[PDB]
C-alpha cells in the first residue's frame, strides 16, 4: 500500500484498538477504487487463531445495505414498487393501522414507530403476525423517523415475495454470486465456521442468536475482501453488468428523506459531501441514531449525489462495524472488529483516514 495509507491506518486504527480493547480487527481502505488491507488481532483469542482477509465477521446492521440494494434490484425488475401497500404482499395484516403504510415506509424506517426490535418472543409466522397486527403506530406513516430491525426486516421478507426465492436465496442469486460475494454468508456454512471469528462481550465468546427477520436486519456475515468489494460495487454502480442490480444500488443511494443534515437511503444513509464530521460522529451515538426524528419527505426521491458520505454502522453482541464512501472520491473504508465498541469512536477514525487521503 502507498505509505500515506500505511502511515494514517497506523495512527489511527492501531490507537482506536489500544483505546477501545478489540480483539480482532480487520480494515479495507479503498483509495482510487482500489482496496488496501489490514489486520489486527485474533479472531479466536484462546485458539490465538490471527485475523486474516478470510476471517468472517459479524455485520450486524450493516446488512440492511444488502436489503436496500436487494430492494432497489425488486423494484428495477418490475416486481415491486414502493408506493404499494404492506397489505399488497401480506393481505392477512388486516388490521386498520396498516391502511396507508408503504414499502417504502417499511424500508425507511417511517411506519409510524415500528419498535428497534422484533420482540425475542415471535418464534413462529403466526406470532409475526400477531406481532404486526397487533403493533399501534405512534405517529402517521411519512412523518417520523424511527430507526427499526422490524420496518426494515419486514420489507425485506415482503420485497421477495414476487420472485417466489426466500430472503436468503433471493440475495444469494441477485446480488451476492453476481458481485462474486463468495464467502458472505446469512447462513455460514459448515465447511466455513473455520473463518468465522468469535465475538467478545465482556470477555466472553459469542455469535448472533437466531430471530426473526434477522438476514434481513443484522444477520449478515462477511470477509474483508467481500467487504471491500461490496464498497467497489456501491461506488462504481456503472461497473456491475446486471442492470437491474446496477439500478438497485443506485436506488438504494437514491435519497428520500431527510432530516437536519442526513438523508435516508435504502438501509445507506448519506449526507452531502464534504460533511461535517461532528454531525456523522455525534449522530452515529445511539441516543440519536435511534431516536425518533421528523423527516421531510423528498419526491421524487434526489437520484444518487456521487458528492455524498454513504456509511453505515453495525453491531451484534459482540461485534462492530462500520462502513463508509464517498463516489465522486473512488474513496470508502471497512472497518469489522469482533468487539461492539462506540460507534462515533468508529466514525471519528473513519473519517480521520478519508480526510487523510481526500
Ligand atoms: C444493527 O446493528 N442493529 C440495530 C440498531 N442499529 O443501530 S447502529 O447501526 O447505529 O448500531 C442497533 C444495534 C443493532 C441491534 N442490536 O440490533
Ligand atoms: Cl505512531
Ligand atoms: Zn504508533
Ligand atoms: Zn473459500
Do not use: C
Not at 197 to 217: F, I, M, T
Not at 314 to 340: C, D, H, R, W
Amino acid at each position: 500500500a502507498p505509505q500515506q495509507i500505511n502511515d494514517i491506518v497506523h495512527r489511527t486504527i492501531t490507537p482506536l484498538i489500544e483505546q477501545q480493547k478489540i480483539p480482532g480487527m480487520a480494515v479495507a481502505v479503498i483509495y482510487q477504487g482500489k482496496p488496501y488491507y489490514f489486520t489486527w488481532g485474533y479472531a479466536d483469542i484462546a485458539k490465538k487463531q490471527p485475523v486474516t482477509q478470510q476471517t468472517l465477521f459479524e455485520l450486524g446492521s450493516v446488512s440492511k445495505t444488502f436489503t436496500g440494494v436487494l430492494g432497489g434490484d425488486a423494484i428495477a425488475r418490475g416486481e415491486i414498487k414502493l408506493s404499494d401497500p404492506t397489505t399488497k404482499y401480506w393481505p392477512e395484516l388486516t388490521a386498520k393501522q396498516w391502511n396507508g403504510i408503504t414499502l417504502l415506509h417499511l424500508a425507511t424506517y417511517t411506519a409510524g414507530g415500528l419498535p428497534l426490535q422484533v420482540p425475542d418472543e415471535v418464534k413462529s409466522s403466526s406470532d409475526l403476525l400477531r406481532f404486526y397486527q397487533n403493533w399501534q403506530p405512534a405517529w402517521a406513516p411519512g412523518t417520523q423517523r424511527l430507526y427499526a430491525n422490524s420496518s426494515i426486516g419486514l420489507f425485506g421478507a415482503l420485497a421477495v415475495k414476487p420472485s417466489g426465492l426466500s430472503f436468503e436465496q433471493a440475495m444469494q442469486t441477485r446480488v451476492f454470486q453476481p458481485l462474486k460475494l463468495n464467502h458472505t454468508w446469512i447462513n455460514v456454512p459448515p465447511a466455513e465456521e473455520k473463518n468465522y471469528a468469535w465475538g467478545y462481550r465482556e470477555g466472553k465468546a459469542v455469535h448472533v442468536s437466531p430471530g426473526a427477520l434477522d438476514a434481513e436486519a443484522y444477520g449478515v456475515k462477511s470477509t474483508i475482501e467481500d467487504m471491500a468489494r461490496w464498497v467497489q460495487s456501491n461506488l462504481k454502480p456503472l461497473d456491475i453488468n446486471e442492470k437491474t442490480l446496477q439500478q438497485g444500488i443506485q436506488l438504494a443511494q437514491s435519497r428520500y428523506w431527510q432530516t437536519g443534515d442526513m438523508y435516508q437511503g435504502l438501509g445507506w444513509e448519506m449526507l452531502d459531501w464534504p460533511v461535517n464530521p461532528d454531525s456523522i460522529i455525534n449522530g452515529s451515538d445511539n441516543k440519536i441514531a435511534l431516536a425518533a426524528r421528523p423527516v421531510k419527505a423528498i419526491t421524487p426521491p434526489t437520484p444518487a449525489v456521487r458528492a455524498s458520505w454513504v456509511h453505515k454502522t453495525g453491531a451484534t453482541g459482540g461485534f462492530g462495524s462500520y462502513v463508509a464512501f464517498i463516489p465522486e472520491k473512488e474513496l470508502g473504508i471497512v472497518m469489522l472488529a469482533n468487539k461492539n465498541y462506540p460507534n462515533p469512536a468508529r466514525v471519528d477514525a473513519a473519517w480521520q483516514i478519508l480526510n487523510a487521503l481526500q
